[PDB]
Amino acid sequence: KNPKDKRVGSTAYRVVSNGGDPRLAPKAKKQSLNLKQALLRRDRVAKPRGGFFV
């Protein structure tokens, strides 16, 4: 990932970074996706997944 900033306390020293999304595709906002899934299953609950298992 990206290097975290080094603050002197007054200012901040960070490194620019755009070497992540080169020509492939942008990574999603996990938050936004979970929001969508929330809006889908607003209140409702899942059934048991499969069968006889710990």
């Binding site: 290097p3 080094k6 603050r7 002197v8 007054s10 200012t11 901040a12 020293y13 960070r14 490194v15 620019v16």
Partner: protein, 109 residues
Amino acid sequence: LGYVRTMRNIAAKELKELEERYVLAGPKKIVFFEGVEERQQALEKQKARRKQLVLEKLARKVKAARKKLKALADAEYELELQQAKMAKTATSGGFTKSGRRIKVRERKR
């Protein structure tokens, strides 16, 4: 009411002046780097009383100005609500001493 407003205006201007003076007497800064190597280089480069009294004085002055201001603001609001309890028809606003809110649902025809 008119008198109160004038003095309020003057003191408002004075708080403006004093605020300006206080500020000019006295995560904020971002410095960017291509790489952590130049970050470290800048780190190496960075490794390479009268004000207090006058600012404390300034601060006490501007705080006092704010207090007088707010008292004048309260005076303006208070006389506005006496106005509401002295309009020629039943009019909204201001508390009674019994605690209720006066709230007439009328319209001034």
